[PDB]
Amino acid sequence: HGFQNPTGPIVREVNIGETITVAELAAQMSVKGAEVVKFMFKMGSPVTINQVLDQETAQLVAEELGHKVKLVSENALEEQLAESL
């Protein structure tokens, strides 16, 4: 069980709330914020470092960069106590 040097890139489990600042999105993918800003500039909508993004854009860009998105909701108990009846 020794060290096997990884070959491919890295993938993270990006947890996305109801909204997220692009700084936190860059933090959770282990990429620098400037790279995320330049990437969004390359395709359409420009951003700033502390601009707030919504579910659709954040999930689309994060899943495009290769990471797996695991989004969550702020009313969890409400659906929890809705499949019980």
Numbering used by the authors: 248 to 332
Quoted passage from the original study:
IF2 is the guanosine triphosphatase (GTPase) that guides the entry of the formyl-methionine initiator tRNA (fMet-tRNAifMet) into the peptidyl (P) site of the ribosome. In the small subunit (30 S) initiation complex, IF2-GTP holds fMet-tRNAifMet in a specific orientation and provides anchor points that accelerate joining of the large subunit (50 S), resulting in the formation of the 70 S initiation complex (70S-IC). Ribosome-stimulated GTP hydrolysis in IF2 and inorganic phosphate (Pi) release is accompanied by a series of conformational changes in IF2 and the ribosome, leading to the accommodation of fMet-tRNAifMet into the P site and IF2 dissociation from the ribosome. Initiation factor IF2 is the largest translation factor in Escherichia coli with an N-terminal region of variable length across bacterial species and a conserved C-terminal region that encompasses four domains.
Local refinement of this region yielded a 2.8-Å resolution map of the N2-globular sub-domain of IF2 interacting with helix h16 of 16 S rRNA. An initial model of the N2 sub-domain was generated with AlphaFold237, and then fit and refined into the density. Using this approach, we traced 85 additional residues (248 to 332), of which residues 266 to 312 form the three-helix bundle sub-domain N2 in IF2 not previously included in the E. coli 70S-IC structures. While structure alignment of the three-helix bundle N2 sub-domain of ribosome-bound P. aeruginosa IF2 (residues 266 to 312) with the NMR structure of the E. coli sub-domain N1 (residues 2–50)38 reveals reasonable homology with a root-mean-square-deviation (RMSD) value of 4.9 Å, alignment with the N/G1 domain from the crystal structure of ribosome-free T. thermophilus IF219,39 shows an almost perfect fit with RMSD of 1 Å. The overall shape of the N2-globular sub-domain complements that of helix h16 in the shoulder region of the 30 S subunit, with residues Ser277, Val278, Lys279 and Arg259 forming the main interface and the extension that emerges from the N2 sub-domain wrapping around the minor groove of h16. In the rotated 70S-IC (II-A), the buried surface area by extended IF2-GDPCP is ~5146 Å2, of which ~1173 Å2 is attributed to the N2 sub-domain. In the 70S-IC, the additional interactions provided by the N2 sub-domain further anchor IF2 on the ribosome, explaining how this region of IF2 stabilizes the binding of fMet-tRNAifMet to the P site of the 30S-IC and promotes joining of the 30 S and 50 S subunits. In the non-rotated 70S-IC the N2 region of compact IF2-GDP is not visible, indicating that the N2 sub-domain disengages from the 30 S shoulder and becomes labile upon back-rotation of the small subunit in the 70S-IC. The region of the N-domain of IF2 proximal to the G-domain that interacts with the 30 S subunit was previously called the N/G1 domain in T. thermophilus IF222,34, and shares high sequence similarity with the distal region of the N-domain of E. coli and P. aeruginosa IF2 (sub-domain N1).
